[PDB]
């Protein structure tokens, strides 16, 4: 059997959250981006994914 509870978000969390660049920079031979990767309180993120 699986765990009854205490491992599942019950409100509206988001699997596969998406982020898009808040800053961009392009050179003749490079591309530069930076995202405001906000994990958000009450959470934990693994960068393997």
């Amino acid at each position: 059997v699986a765990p009854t509870h205490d491992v599942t978000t019950d409100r509206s969390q988001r699997l596969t959250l998406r982020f898009v660049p808040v800053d961009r920079e392009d050179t003749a031979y490079s591309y530069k981006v930076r995202f405001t990767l906000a994990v958000g309180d009450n959470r934990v993120l693994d960068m393997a994914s």
Binding site: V1, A2, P3, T4, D6, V7
Partner: peptide, 19 residues
């Protein structure tokens, strides 16, 4: 300190599940 948290949320086989 009127409780213990422990931690058993691990699937469950019976009264069990760790390591």
């Amino acid at each position: 300190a009127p409780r213990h948290g422990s931690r058993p949320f691990m699937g469950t086989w019976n009264e069990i599940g760790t390591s």
